[PDB]
Design a protein around this ligand. Structure first.
Ligand SMILES: Nc1ccn([C@H]2C[C@H](O)[C@@H](CNC(=O)CC[C@H](NC(=O)C[C@@H]3CCC[C@H]3C(=O)c3ccc(CC(=O)O)cc3)C(=O)O)O2)c(=O)n1
Lengths: 226, 227
């Protein structure tokens, strides 16, 4: 196999998709083959489609999903409202394992935070990460409350022996502010801050996004991933 | 002693202060003596003062603070900004131990969520709860993300064998949309939902707040909290 990272977050709306896209873009520019798996996508009635954003921003073509629910809710609720079950644990684990190959970086994008139910019955991205022996990249904010949410998420990871690959600040404000700047330092005391993506990077075109992403991560860290 | 409950939350801004006041008011109307303490209060330069709001909303007079810092930030950062130190672990424990008394419900209001550092080094309200043998009441929202944050918080309580006294939904909208209604039902499968306080409760006057508080909790649960 190659390298599988689950990409999780401390909460909903932290910008996991732009982080997946930026790491994919950075890894591709280092000559690494990248695949991204989003097993479950909700919010499709209003056009939510995180895999398409990854394709547009980073140029990834190996983009795998299993299930799409119209309502903008947690997967289990969205599945309930549609009258259909979530995918089964075996579907997710084997899809990811079949994506994995030597020399490839495979990113698994969850929905919301680490412990939200993604598959039947009550299986989370954490469970998935155990099954495929993935490490976790944790997307965080720079806002008030991020320290508690980050610590909580890293404790949950450690409790099932899922390694933390580091943190990414999904949206770095401009200008920062006292809280954001304090939080960036405090976050780096609990884990490695791999990148802080500028606020608004999601709206960039592919060329600008590729330039941002190349600058955003440490080149040796990206290259060492695989 | 009596019964000590730490009142924590899944994040900042979930309404811990109103839940403290509501539970205090309900316990007082059942004849239970109540004290509330706030070991760390930040944002005092903004006028933040949770103890004084609990006193205003519930009439509680047995109010105990310890550390106060001006900037509206996490305690560690607020203390550093002021050139001050965080309290030591044993200082928070002494603040609480001095209030504990048979027949009294002592509420310990955290700052932000459960793993916020309240004392050097990296001492949290979870450690305090172990020290004083307290159970934890967890204030949650009904919003997107609450299920993950609630499960993360309960898992962290279990890791130190801190019992969970239940959840309180800090603000319950009227009417509830689909997300809020789904979350309430899912929260109730994670842990006992003790109350769900109507949104805007902090703007009720003394009498309305008292009535809301009495209606919001199961009288048997409240009465059962303290012998
Ligand atoms: N039923 C109901 C229910 C609710 N209400 C009303 C009551 C109220 O008016 C409001 C609910 N209350 C609010 O919103 C507080 C406003 C908010 N206050 C904070 O955030 C916490 C402090 C403020 C500055 C520092 C922060 C900190 O303590 C902190 C601690 C740890 C960390 C570490 C980490 O990073 O984790 C970071 C920060 C803000 O200032 O933004 O609704 C109602 O009426 N009826």
């Amino acid at each position: 196999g190659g390298t599988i990272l689950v990409v999780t977050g401390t909460g909903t709306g932290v910008g996991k998709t732009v982080v997946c896209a930026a790491l994919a873009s950075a890894a591709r520019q280092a000559g690494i083959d990248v695949a991204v798996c989003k097993p479950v996508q909700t919010g499709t009635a209003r056009g939510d489609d995180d895999l398409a954003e990854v394709g547009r921003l980073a140029g990834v073509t190996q983009l795998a999903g299993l299930a799409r629910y119209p309502q903008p809710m947690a997967p289990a609720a969205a599945a309930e409202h549609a009258g259909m079950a979530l995918p089964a644990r075996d579907q997710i684990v084997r899809l990811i394992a079949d994506l994995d190959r030597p020399g490839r970086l495979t990113l698994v994008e969850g929905a919301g935070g680490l412990l939200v139910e993604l598959a039947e019955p009550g299986v989370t991205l954490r469970d998935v990460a155990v099954d495929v022996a993935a490490a976790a990249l944790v997307v965080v904010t720079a806002d008030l409350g991020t320290l508690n949410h980050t610590k909580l998420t890293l404790e949950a990871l450690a409790a099932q022996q899922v390694s933390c690959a580091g943190l990414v600040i999904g949206s770095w404000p401009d200008p920062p502010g006292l809280v954001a700047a304090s939080n960036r330092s405090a976050l780096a005391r609990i884990a490695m801050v791999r990148a802080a993506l500028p606020a608004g990077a999601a709206s960039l075109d592919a060329g600008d996004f590729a330039a941002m992403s190349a600058a955003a991560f440490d080149r040796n860290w990206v290259a060492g991933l695989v």
